Amino acid sequence: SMDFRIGQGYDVHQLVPGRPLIIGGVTIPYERGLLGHSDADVLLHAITDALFGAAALGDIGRHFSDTDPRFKGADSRALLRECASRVAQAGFAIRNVDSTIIAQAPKLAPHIDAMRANIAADLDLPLDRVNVKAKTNEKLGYLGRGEGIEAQAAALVVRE
Amino acid sequence: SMDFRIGQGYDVHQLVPGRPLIIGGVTIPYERGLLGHSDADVLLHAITDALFGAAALGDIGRHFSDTDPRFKGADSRALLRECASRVAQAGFAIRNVDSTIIAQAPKLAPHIDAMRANIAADLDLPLDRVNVKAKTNEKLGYLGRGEGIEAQAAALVVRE
Amino acid sequence: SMDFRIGQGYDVHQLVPGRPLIIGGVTIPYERGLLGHSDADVLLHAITDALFGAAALGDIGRHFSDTDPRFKGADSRALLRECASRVAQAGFAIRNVDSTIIAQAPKLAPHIDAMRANIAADLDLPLDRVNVKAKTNEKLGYLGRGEGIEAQAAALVVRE
Numbered sequence A, B, C: 001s002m003d004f005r006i007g008q009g010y011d012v013h014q015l016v017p018g019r020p021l022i023i024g025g026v027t028i029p030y031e032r033g034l035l036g037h038s039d040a041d042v043l044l045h046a047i048t049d050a051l052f053g054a055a056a057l058g059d060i061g062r063h064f065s066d067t068d069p070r071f072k073g074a075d076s077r078a079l080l081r082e083c084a085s086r087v088a089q090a091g092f093a094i095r096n097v098d099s100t101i102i103a104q105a106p107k108l109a110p111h112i113d114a115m116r117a118n119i120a121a122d123l124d125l126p127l128d129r130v131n132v133k134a135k136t137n138e139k140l141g142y143l144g145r146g147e148g149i150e151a152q153a154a155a156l157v158v159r160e
């Protein structure tokens, strides 16, 4: 139809020793990884919130608790898939997703295409409706010191 | 019509003793509040900027001077309603709003539905076109240290 | 048509004495300037990234490397024009751009119309489809201490 909606998402996680670095579903070689419930995939979380936001469904904290037995061990791609399911349940179709990762290190350019392919598969979208961008923070703040990684996302949906 | 436009907004205010904590029009019980010339409602200001931006009307500083005495302690819902009136006068209807609050404390989940209802009333929208998300900053930076609260917003409008 | 897409952009640069301050194509008198490859125009970079993102074409790093002889001596307005040409070639018409500059100083309001005019010319857009907003960071963080300047952008396009 013509009932378009926009959503915007934000996430950040600390970088800590002793955990794999997983962003956009991609395991990236690195001496640290993101701290959170399961894989702490900051990019998928930001997209997830943008999609909930566009459908006016709240946010991750309203949908996915640590205690739901359906979602206890769930990695962030299972949660992205569930998000997409609830968006459809509310009567919306996803039109496109754009996003930005902010990380001072490691280099993410080798991994961007795989992230895009993972997101497109999880959202049942063609590749040309999914975009992932990657920036440093020019050595400013906790991002520039390598203390965490931020992701931003925007999503367009339509109510059919 | 199909003459859609998108806008985005950002705001931050310091958290200090001796001020009311007003977010999304809701007076939240808390030992600190947000510092500003107005009532310092960081969520409504971000949404206000997103709406002005979608209509290419500038920003909240252009329309409501931060140094004008008439706005000392101003009700930011009244400012939001006048923003919406000017956006309508420019020829735009609002289609949806999404937003994020980033705060270490207090817990905002008990207040989100009330915020959504306030925004929807001020924009003459049904609740299903308004979304408010609430996150921490995962202990990072001045937001992690509870020194301020940030808000982000996105808005879709259409010129009729 | 009805095939709308949204994009979002982010950029940040350090602010130190010894370089000019160029934002939105406007040189602004100031005791500090932004550090980057050439003019370090944080606003035009964020808009460029939002436009590539809406078209699902990647980001600035994928299109304009520092070493490429075609763009080694290019300022950010030439990059923005080339970005717009590629977005057009991919089949997309730009519908509007909105943006925010976060800088604790200097005051940017006097320069907003000039920035809008530069951006609209570079994108071949009517002025009333381009918006620029400017905020402080309320003295919080590296932005609030004047150590950097950030820009955020949103763009709406339609595939024709």
Ligand SMILES: COc1cc(NS(=O)(=O)c2ccc(N)cc2)ncn1
Pocket (backbone or CB within 6 Å): A011, A035, A036, A037, A038, A039, A040, A045, A060, A061, A064, A065, A066, A071, B135
């Ligand atoms: C709870 O709101 C969040 C959380 C989060 N990441 S997390 O704490 O690892 C987490 C927590 C719970 C679930 N179900 C999944 C992940 N990112 C963004 N917003």
Ligand SMILES: COc1cc(NS(=O)(=O)c2ccc(N)cc2)ncn1
Pocket (backbone or CB within 6 Å): B011, B035, B036, B037, B038, B039, B040, B041, B045, B060, B061, B064, B065, B066, B067, B071, B074, B079, C135
């Ligand atoms: C001036 O640009 C701002 C200001 C602001 N908050 S404020 O200084 O309390 C304020 C002061 C006066 C009015 N009329 C409204 C708000 N938030 C976001 N952008």
Ligand SMILES: COc1cc(NS(=O)(=O)c2ccc(N)cc2)ncn1
Pocket (backbone or CB within 6 Å): A135, C011, C035, C036, C037, C038, C040, C045, C060, C061, C064, C065, C066, C071
């Ligand atoms: C490379 O991705 C960037 C770069 C940047 N600024 S920059 O490193 O000065 C720069 C680098 C290369 C060119 N061609 C122009 C500017 N800002 C945002 N994203």
Ligand SMILES: [Mg+2]
Pocket (backbone or CB within 6 Å): none
């Ligand atoms: Mg930030």
Ligand SMILES: [Zn+2]
Pocket (backbone or CB within 6 Å): A011, A012, A013, A036, A040, A041, A042, A045
């Ligand atoms: Zn997360």
Ligand SMILES: [Zn+2]
Pocket (backbone or CB within 6 Å): B011, B012, B013, B036, B040, B041, B042, B045
């Ligand atoms: Zn404010």
Ligand SMILES: [Zn+2]
Pocket (backbone or CB within 6 Å): C011, C012, C013, C036, C040, C041, C042, C045
């Ligand atoms: Zn830049």
